[PDB]
Ligand binder design. Sequence first.
Ligand SMILES: OC[C@H]1O[C@@](CO)(O[C@H]2O[C@H](CO)[C@@H](O)[C@H](O)[C@H]2O)[C@@H](O)[C@@H]1O
Ligand SMILES: OC[C@H]1O[C@@](CO)(O[C@H]2O[C@H](CO)[C@@H](O)[C@H](O)[C@H]2O)[C@@H](O)[C@@H]1O
Ligand SMILES: OC[C@H]1O[C@@](CO)(O[C@H]2O[C@H](CO)[C@@H](O)[C@H](O)[C@H]2O)[C@@H](O)[C@@H]1O
Ligand SMILES: O=N[O-]
Ligand SMILES: O=N[O-]
Ligand SMILES: O=N[O-]
Ligand SMILES: O=N[O-]
Ligand SMILES: O=N[O-]
Ligand SMILES: O=N[O-]
Ligand SMILES: [Cu+2]
Ligand SMILES: [Cu+2]
Ligand SMILES: [Cu+2]
Ligand SMILES: [Cu+2]
Ligand SMILES: [Cu+2]
Ligand SMILES: [Cu+2]
Lengths: 334, 334, 334
Amino acid sequence: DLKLPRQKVELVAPPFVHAHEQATKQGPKIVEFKLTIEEKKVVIDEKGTTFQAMTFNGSMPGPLMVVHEGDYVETTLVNPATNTMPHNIDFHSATGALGGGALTLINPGEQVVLRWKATKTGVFVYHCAPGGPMIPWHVVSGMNGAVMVLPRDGLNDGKGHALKYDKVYYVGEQDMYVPRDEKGNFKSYDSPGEAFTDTEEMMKKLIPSHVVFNGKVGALTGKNALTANVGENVLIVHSQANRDSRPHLIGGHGDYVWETGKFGNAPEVGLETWFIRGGSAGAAMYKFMQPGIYAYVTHNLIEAADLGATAHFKVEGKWNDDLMTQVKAPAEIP
Amino acid sequence: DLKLPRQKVELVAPPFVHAHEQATKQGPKIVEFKLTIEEKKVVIDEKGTTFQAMTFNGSMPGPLMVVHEGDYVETTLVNPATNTMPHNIDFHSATGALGGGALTLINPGEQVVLRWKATKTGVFVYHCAPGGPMIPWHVVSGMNGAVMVLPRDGLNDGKGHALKYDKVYYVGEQDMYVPRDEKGNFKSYDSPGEAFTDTEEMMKKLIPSHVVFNGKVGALTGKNALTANVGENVLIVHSQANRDSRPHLIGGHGDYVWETGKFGNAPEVGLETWFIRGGSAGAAMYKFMQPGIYAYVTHNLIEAADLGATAHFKVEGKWNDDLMTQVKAPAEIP
Amino acid sequence: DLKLPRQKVELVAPPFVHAHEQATKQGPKIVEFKLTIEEKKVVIDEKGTTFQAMTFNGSMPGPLMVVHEGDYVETTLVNPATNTMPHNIDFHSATGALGGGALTLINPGEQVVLRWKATKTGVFVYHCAPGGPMIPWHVVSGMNGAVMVLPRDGLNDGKGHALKYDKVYYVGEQDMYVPRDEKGNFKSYDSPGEAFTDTEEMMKKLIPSHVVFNGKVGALTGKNALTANVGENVLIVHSQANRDSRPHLIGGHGDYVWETGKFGNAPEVGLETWFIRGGSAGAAMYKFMQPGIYAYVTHNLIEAADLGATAHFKVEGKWNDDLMTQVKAPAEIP
Ligand SMILES: OC[C@H]1O[C@@](CO)(O[C@H]2O[C@H](CO)[C@@H](O)[C@H](O)[C@H]2O)[C@@H](O)[C@@H]1O
Ligand SMILES: OC[C@H]1O[C@@](CO)(O[C@H]2O[C@H](CO)[C@@H](O)[C@H](O)[C@H]2O)[C@@H](O)[C@@H]1O
Ligand SMILES: OC[C@H]1O[C@@](CO)(O[C@H]2O[C@H](CO)[C@@H](O)[C@H](O)[C@H]2O)[C@@H](O)[C@@H]1O
Ligand SMILES: O=N[O-]
Ligand SMILES: O=N[O-]
Ligand SMILES: O=N[O-]
Ligand SMILES: O=N[O-]
Ligand SMILES: O=N[O-]
Ligand SMILES: O=N[O-]
Ligand SMILES: [Cu+2]
Ligand SMILES: [Cu+2]
Ligand SMILES: [Cu+2]
Ligand SMILES: [Cu+2]
Ligand SMILES: [Cu+2]
Ligand SMILES: [Cu+2]
């Protein structure tokens, strides 16, 4: 029935984002994506704690999907026989059928194809939601990502001016609930099913053991620091499918911020810290003015420094002494 | 002194809302309401857990009161002799005397009459606040509701256009603190006074045992699902008198949202999830586009699925395959 | 290199704010501040619980610094030899070097001088951030305050009209983590270092033992209540460097509120309760209409009434019976 051009996208692992246009002269298309679910035991911290993860495409978060307003998003969801549980997908960008969840429940060995029209602009969470108590469990096990639906004219500041990013990163934040044994050590489990009873008991107490970006403590640091140059405008998409977060770029700002994540609303300007409601994605852009290391955190600093929720940027360029200078280096008090 | 027409309102139990006009040609009136406090032991979950509730008019939340800007709200608060505690009422819509609390403290066997002028538009919490540590206790025992103060011209989108709802529902969310015994079972108590010591100890640890809509797990489901038809614009007022919430309509959106709840501010558009600050009411309107079941949740999914905070909508009408379609039903992977 | 006039400021302890202009005819200056770090054991509640505090200038919060857009803020940070730990300072208002933290690490016996240009308007947190797990620890030990960067034309409502406050107060909210012994009593420690292991274990569980304004339960009450008169427009700056808060003026409103705290954005109007994201400052102004006592709280009422987070205003003037009146005093039910 729907006679539009088809375009395939090759998804890439976070924090990177598949190539796309901001402003476009294309009209509506059917944009084709494939997500393959993977249940796997992973390491989540530098001490070697393990975790029974459930993922879209092998990553936490799932990859960022990018389309334009009025596109149709056609997703093939694949649940290989090597998995143990049923799964589905719910897109907060989509209208009807519990976001798609009611049309995409697949057992191991099955796949399904869902199409939805991208009628709402912004960044949006997608997540698994099989039913009942399985809903939180699959989400906090890692089965969540985001989609970005851009205006065809690209982003604007609300005030007729264009807002073009030089690069975009997707930071997915994951609250994790790893039980401890009597000794106080984190437990390991042989299967997601075996982790379930202890994990649910902990979940209901609402305090995570770990809060991480890109699936692990330190994931977005070292060789895998985010990067920029002085003068570059960087868009940072941040999602949290279950729990609030308060992003902050240490040493920078949010020049233009859509904390509720929806481009029909003008961005706020000049923020220190913004707020991502659990169950949402938001976005912030910043033009870097100074070189050096930045930390990108949730500004519950206990979560940031002690539970895992810190990324770094390494920024190249020339130091600006007008903006900041060390007038007198540390010295003995006179 | 005040020579205005008087109008009585017959309050109705949530989630329903007493009949009212949006835009009105009436001028200011004295609008008369009566609230009768009821302390009662209630069942809060499907397992039969009991709870020492304290309520306005017998319900959690208390009923929604609806007036227009510049009306005078005259409330008779009644504390029958069958109750055990003093109570009062604080309206966040009102100016002075701790919202009215300092003028409405009544012992069992007493009533009081308070009038306040509705100078601020929006949805607002009202709650009991007797003094000191009793304040949180009475609120988290159920003594809270909301009032809506509409502009005389009805609602608008900020952008000169009218926003008329076909129906309004009031979802009051309640964080509850039910202690457990050594065995791990929820405790039952013979009186609110007897529940107090254990309940306060738990309260101070800040983690609820239950988070419910309309006073009980599953209250707004089954026969008591909320309803709509495709094409209907529904306003959802959400309050939380003590703790944050993040509402989300699964399969829908917030087309126009006042998350801080105040109509002097333009609504935001096209939200996935919004945020109700503890101690406030907010409001979201959505025009339904697809039939079927929706879930309305707080998008801490642990709270939603495991602690009680899920409502349903059942929506009638014609499925829209342009907006969403199952291109290929579940099938074996090729 | 920088040839501008220099102006010294004498900082004053919170909740008060050093004298400053709103609108100004001055051009950019170098504004000179000195902060001297003090580690000290303090009493935090009316029961005599003690706490190993770490402070800027001896207070929790640190003092409010006020400048105008385009000023250069030159801070001498002093860490006397009587302290035990290294410290630094990070300004969320500043651009580069982790907000200044990477240029201001000083051992006991040292001082440092940092200058930053005030390119972003609003209220902003400043805090210590030595590195790693020390970051949260120093912040939740009290090492945080705020700076306000005003437009040179003063504040406006977004809608070309000026917003002039008659007085400003700074309310700094502190989440504190005091461990308990087996008996259930709060522990006391001989040094910050000795408090660290128990305090970190508690911190990671994310639930504070105390949430206070101005460093202690009841600090902003009694003789130290905030004050106003009917007709006065009061600006309330609220900061929280680590954890969310939801301010509310009981019996009043936020007439104009910048909850994200940044003056490049128009204020919202007529709020009941607003939201301060952990890691930020916000500001609300209210013109008092009624005399009497008000409470200023976070509207998690458990935190407010039971954990410490209540201030009072005592307001002088004439009661307005049009806005509110007790129509019938408490009486026996007919
Ligand atoms: O940034 C969105 C915000 O900007 C306004 C103008 O104040 O509208 C701009 O953005 C719309 C969505 O991209 C465009 O359709 C419109 O043409 C453009 O002016 C606001 O209406 C909107 O909330
Ligand atoms: O929706 C409120 C928002 O709309 C504006 C226009 O942008 O004002 C409209 O709403 C006011 C309150 O109902 C009316 O008094 C006004 O006439 C109407 O234009 C904004 O000023 C306001 O924040
Ligand atoms: O209150 C800030 C808000 O107001 C607007 C006008 O709607 O701009 C005013 O404030 C700016 C910052 O102080 C001034 O530069 C400007 O001249 C004045 O109109 C908005 O643009 C801004 O977001
Ligand atoms: O799943 N390991 O690459
Ligand atoms: O800005 N530091 O958390
Ligand atoms: O109070 N029972 O209907
Ligand atoms: O949209 N589901 O939580
Ligand atoms: O430090 N005592 O004043
Ligand atoms: O308005 N009282 O919390
Ligand atoms: Cu799943
Ligand atoms: Cu969801
Ligand atoms: Cu009561
Ligand atoms: Cu209140
Ligand atoms: Cu320090
Ligand atoms: Cu910070």
